[PDB]
Paper text:
According to the crystallographic contacts, DtolTA is a monomer, and no functional dimer similar to bsDATA was found in the crystal cell based on contact analysis. The DtolTA monomer is distinguished by the O-pocket loop (residues 97–100), which is significantly shorter than that in bsDAAT (residues 92–110), the C-terminal α-helix (residues 256–286), which is approximately twice as large as that in bsDATA (residues 263–277), and, finally, by the unique position of the O-pocket α-helix (residues 22–27). Two regions (regions 1 and 2) important for dimerization in classical transaminases were identified and analyzed. In DtolTA, region 1 (C and pink rectangle in Figure 5) was shorter than in other transaminases and included an α-helix (residues 22–27), so that the residues of region 1 did not protrude from the subunits as in homologous transaminases. In addition, in DtolTA, the position of α-helix 22–27 was reinforced by the salt bridge Asp26–Arg3. This salt bridge also positioned the N-terminus directly at the dimer interface, preventing dimer formation.
Here, we describe a monomeric PLP-dependent fold type IV transaminase found in a marine aromatic-compound-degrading sulfate-reducing bacterium Desulfobacula toluolica Tol2. To the best of our knowledge, this is the first active monomeric PLP-dependent enzyme among the known fold type I and IV transaminases. The new monomeric transaminase (DtolTA) is stereoselective and active toward D-alanine and (R)-phenylethylamine. The results show that the active site of the transaminase, formed by a single subunit, is active in PLP-catalyzed deamination but is insufficient for double-substrate transamination.
Author numbering: 1 to 286
């Protein structure tokens, strides 16, 4: 695990440390459970969704998350305050073993979807690898380091992971979806992937919208029969895919891909604005 926090301060178990003192990163084991959230205008985005995964992952694995809801909010709010920053990505790491508990909360670098990428969609590549404890967002679980070199010398915004069996699972930080030659929606199924928050939103939207998403094992060879792809995820929203290694797609020109994108943006805006509205009613009759 790298000394990965940005800005000036992070949290380490209810103490605010400065990012000039990052040694605690070294003590973090690969079994640590994490979460990433967007902060937008000081609102941790889909907090309830993330904490439910965080808590429920812990519980199912057989640890505990050391901190209750109210405290995690307090930690995020101090990172926002101490860092003089109300937008970016926040990471929460949890590890506990009988006394020896480590909870970290901190900003990491944000992606910026360039011009090219916004109109064309993103370049992506294939990476051969499968995630240990894939149902769980763990340190062990993260492909990020594995795929650094590759991604850069590629201009690829995501490395899509490939099994033994030559199925495309998920992105290193994203769920992937596919539009059939057929115009049916495909994603790799639940049990081969991380149950993404945003995956879940996309599923719900598709379903409001009336295209069912067919959960389905997708091979390397199936790339011929695919007209579009998108990637989902906290750090990447719903991003159109222009290309997968060599296979060009024209994902931004499928009317449905665009529809989902926008549908998601709406959800974010309405989440944030619900919150900020409440806070303000609360400032008003103070």
């Amino acid at each position: 695990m790298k000394r990965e926090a940005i800005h000036n301060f992070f949290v380490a178990n209810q103490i605010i440390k400065s990012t000039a003192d990052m040694a605690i990163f070294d003590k973090v084991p690969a079994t640590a459970i994490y979460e990433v959230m967007q902060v937008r205008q000081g609102i941790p985005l889909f907090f309830e969704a993330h904490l439910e995964r965080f808590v429920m992952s812990a519980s199912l694995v057989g640890t505990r998350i050391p901190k209750k809801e109210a405290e995690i909010l307090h930690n995020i709010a101090d990172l926002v305050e101490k860092n003089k920053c109300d937008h970016g990505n926040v990471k929460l790491v949890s590890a506990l073993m009988n006394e020896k508990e480590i909870f970290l909360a901190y900003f990491i670098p944000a992606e910026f979807l360039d011009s090219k990428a916004r109109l064309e969609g993103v370049h992506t590549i294939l990476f051969s690898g499968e995630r240990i404890c894939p149902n769980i967002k763990t340190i062990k679980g993260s492909f990020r380091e594995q795929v650094k070199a590759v991604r850069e010398s590629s201009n690829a915004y995501e490395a899509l992971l490939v099994n033994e069996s030559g199925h495309i699972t998920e992105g290193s930080r994203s769920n992937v979806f596919f539009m059939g030659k057929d115009n049916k929606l495909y994603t790799s199924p639940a049990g081969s992937v991380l149950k993404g928050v945003t995956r879940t939103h996309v599923m719900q939207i598709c379903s409001r919208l009336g295209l069912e998403v067919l959960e389905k094992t997708v091979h390397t060879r199936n790339l011929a029969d695919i007209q579009g792809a998108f990637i989902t995820g906290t750090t990447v929203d719903v991003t159109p895919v222009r290309s997968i290694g060599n296979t060009q797609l024209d994902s931004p020109n499928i009317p449905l891909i665009r529809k989902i994108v926008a549908e998601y943006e709406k959800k974010i805006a309405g989440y944030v604005s619900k919150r900020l509205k409440r806070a303000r009613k609360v400032y008003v009759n103070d």
